[PDB]
Structure formats: C-alpha cells, structure tokens
Amino acid sequence: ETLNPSARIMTFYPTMEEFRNFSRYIAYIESQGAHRAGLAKVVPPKEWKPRASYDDIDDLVIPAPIQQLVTGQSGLFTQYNIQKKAMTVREFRKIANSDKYCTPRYSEFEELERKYWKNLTFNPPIYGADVNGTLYEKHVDEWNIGRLRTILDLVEKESGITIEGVNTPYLYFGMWKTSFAWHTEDMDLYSINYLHFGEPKSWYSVPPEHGKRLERLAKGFFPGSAQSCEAFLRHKMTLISPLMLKKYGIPFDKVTQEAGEFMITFPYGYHAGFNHGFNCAESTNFATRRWIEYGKQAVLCSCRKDMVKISMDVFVRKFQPERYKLWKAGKDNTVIDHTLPTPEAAEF
Ligand SMILES: [Zn+2]
Numbered sequence: 001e002t003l004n005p006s007a008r009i010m011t012f013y014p015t016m017e018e019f020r021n022f023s024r025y026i027a028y029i030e031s032q033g034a035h036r037a038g039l040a041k042v043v044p045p046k047e048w049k050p051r052a053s054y055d056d057i058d059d060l061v062i063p064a065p066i067q068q069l070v071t072g073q074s075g076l077f078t079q080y081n082i083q084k085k086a087m088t089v090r091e092f093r094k095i096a097n098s099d100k101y102c103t104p105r106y107s108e109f110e111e112l113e114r115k116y117w118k119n120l121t122f123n124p125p126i127y128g129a130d131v132n133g134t135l136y137e138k139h140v141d142e143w144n145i146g147r148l149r150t151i152l153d154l155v156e157k158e159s160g161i162t163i164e165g166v167n168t169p170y171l172y173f174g175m176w177k178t179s180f181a182w183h184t185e186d187m188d189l190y191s192i193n194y195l196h197f198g199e200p201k202s203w204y205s206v207p208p209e210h211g212k213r214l215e216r217l218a219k220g221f222f223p224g225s226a227q228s229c230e231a232f233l234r235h236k237m238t239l240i241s242p243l244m245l246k247k248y249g250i251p252f253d254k255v256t257q258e259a260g261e262f263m264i265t266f267p268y269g270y271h272a273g274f275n276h277g278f279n280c281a282e283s284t285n286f287a288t289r290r291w292i293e294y295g296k297q298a299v300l301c302s303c304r305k306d307m308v309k310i311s312m313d314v315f316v317r318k319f320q321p322e323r324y325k326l327w328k329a330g331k332d333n334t335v336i337d338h339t340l341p342t343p344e345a346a347e348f
Pocket of ligand 1: 228229230231232233234235301302303
C-alpha cells in the first residue's frame with residue numbers, strides 16, 4: 001500500500017540500456033508501483049525508433065473498417081460497430097483529414113475532451129481497427145511488439161495456438177472521435193500500445209483495486225446486458241463519461257499519449273479513451289508471473305462462440321506446480337492483492 005498511494009498514472013523515461021530488457025523494465029516500473037493505476041506511460045530513448053519511415057505504407061489494406069455508431073445519454077452510451085468495405089491507408093487518411101471528419105479546432109485538451117463527450121453520438125467516424133500487422137522493421141530488437149519475449153507465448157510455443165491480436169500484433173488507424181470502450185484486455189492480460197505517428201490518443205484508467213466498483217455501476221446501468229453475459233463489458237461496447245465516474249465515486253485518472261510513446265495496461269486494469277485525429281497505433285497482449293493468478297480468476301464472455309479463452313493449465317503447471325493438484329481440484333482459493341508487484345521485482 002506504500003508505493004504510489006494516490007494510485008495515479010506514472011510515466012517513465014528508460015535509458016537505452018534499461019530499455020533493452022523488456023520483461024525486466026516491466027518488473028522495474030511495477031516496483032515503482034505503476035500497476036496500481038492500471039495504466040502507465042513509457043517514453044522510449046530519443047535514439048530509439050521502430051521504423052525508419054512511414055512513407056511507404058499508404059497502400060496498406062485495412063480489410064475490415066468499422067463505423068462507430070453511438071446511442072445514449074447522460075454520460076452512458078452504447079457503441080455499435082458497422083463493418084464497411086476494405087480500403088487502403090491512403091483512402092483512410094483522406095477520409096480522416098476531410099473537414100467532415102477532421103479534428104475540431106481547440107486550444108487545451110480539456111476543451112477537446114468536452115467536444116468528444118458533447119458530440120460522440122453525432123457524425124459516426126470510421127476506425128481502421130484490428131488490422132493484422134506490424135510496422136516495426138525486422139531488425140528492431142528492443143520492445144518489438146511482434147516478439148516481446150514474455151511467458152505469454154507458452155500459449156503458442158508449447159501449445160501451438162495463434163490468438164490473433166493477443167500474441168500477434170494489431171494495427172489501429174484512427175481519426176478524431178474514434179473510441180475504445182471500457183474493457184480489460186482478454187484473460188485480464190497486460191497490453192502494450194505504441195503510437196507510431198499522427199494525432200494523440202487519450203486514455204482513462206480505473207485502478208484494478210477499484211475495478212469491481214466500476215463493474216457494479218455498469219451492471220446497474222445496463223441491467224439487460226448484465227443478465228446476458230457474466231462479462232458484458234468484454235464486448236467493448238460500453239462508454240462511460242468521466243462525469244459519470246466522478247458522480248458515482250469511481251476513482252480514475254486521465255492521460256494523453258503522444259506519437260512515439262508506449263502505454264502499458266495492467267491486469268484487471270479497466271481502460272477507455274479516444275483518438276484526437278488521424279493516427280496509427282500498434283498493440284498486443286503480454287504477461288508476467290503475476291498475471292497467472294489473474295488469468296485463473298478471469299471471468300469471461302458467456303454470450304458467445306468466440307471469447308478469447310486461454311487454457312490456464314500450462315501456466316499453473318510450470319510456474320505454480322505446488323498448487324496444480326489443488327487448482328485442478330478446483331479448491332484453489334488464492335485471493336489477489338492488486339497492490340503487490342510481480343515477483344520479478346524482488347531485485348529492485
Ligand atoms: Zn458479455
């Protein structure tokens with residue numbers, strides 16, 4: 001309870017030598033208490049770059065664009081994704097920077113934040129989301145989202161199971177007013193998120209130690225949905241105003257992400273936000289030893305066919321062999337302490 005008592009979003013500025021060991025820097029920042037906020041920003045060394053130039057990607061194909069339709073009032077909204085026909089980045093850029101769709105003029109980001117919550121049901125934008133891809137170029141060995149070096153890919157090394165987006169990279173091409181809803185990442189994993197180029201991306205975060213209180217509110221407000229799925233927030237369809245969070249006493253923080261910066265979301269950290277204008281972000285999940293407990297306790301999407309669901313079996317068997325017989329019995333009643341850092345942080 002001592003490291004980051006306010007539970008605010010922190011920012012770290014690793015040195016090139018510190019930057020090179022990914023898993024070890026995550027253990028670092030968690031020792032500093034970054035995980036309590038549920039979200040952290042990491043700025044890479046000025047020397048570092050993931051790709052020489054972004055000039056040559058305008059023929060990149062966005063196969064399944066989404067038009068984001070939003071109904072709702074008083075701070076609470078539901079977001080419907082209409083899929084439109086594929087288009088190339090160029091076609092997207094042009095659409096994004098057109099005046100129908102360009103960022104409104106503004107001074108301070110607070111005003112841009114109010115414009116978002118004021119006009120999010122008007123003029124449904126298009127989000128080139130969930131594009132299978134990397135923009136890293138092959139040789140970049142530090143923080144390559146394509147190959148981050150984590151215990152996560154025991155999923156597909158030892159069990160041979162490709163979960164596209166979870167342990168393969170995703171691209172996001174956004175424009176002004178495009179949202180991602182309140183959501184923890186699948187299986188309550190960590191996620192990483194680099195913004196390659198373009199306008200900023202603004203994030204909201206609820207501390208994992210107060211996540212259950214966010215869940216209670218949403219159940220109250222969408223009773224119909226709560227009835228249908230254990231974890232209806234996993235549908236990534238539900239948007240809640242910061243005004244509503246303040247009103248009902250759910251703690252949270254805001255942070256804006258600039259081009260060239262990394263965001264880390266932590267297990268059972270709820271997040272949401274919006275893009276300021278045309279940009280491109282790259283994202284994948286990943287894990288540490290601390291995630292293993294969250295993995296096990298993860299409530300999942302009952303609604304569906306397709307829930308990303310990961311066999312916990314292989315992880316417990318390797319890193320928790322002294323509880324595997326107990327767990328398999330279903331009598332593993334370990335209680336999670338959201339403030340505790342991952343064990344890898346013992347050294348720091
Ligand atoms: Zn659901």
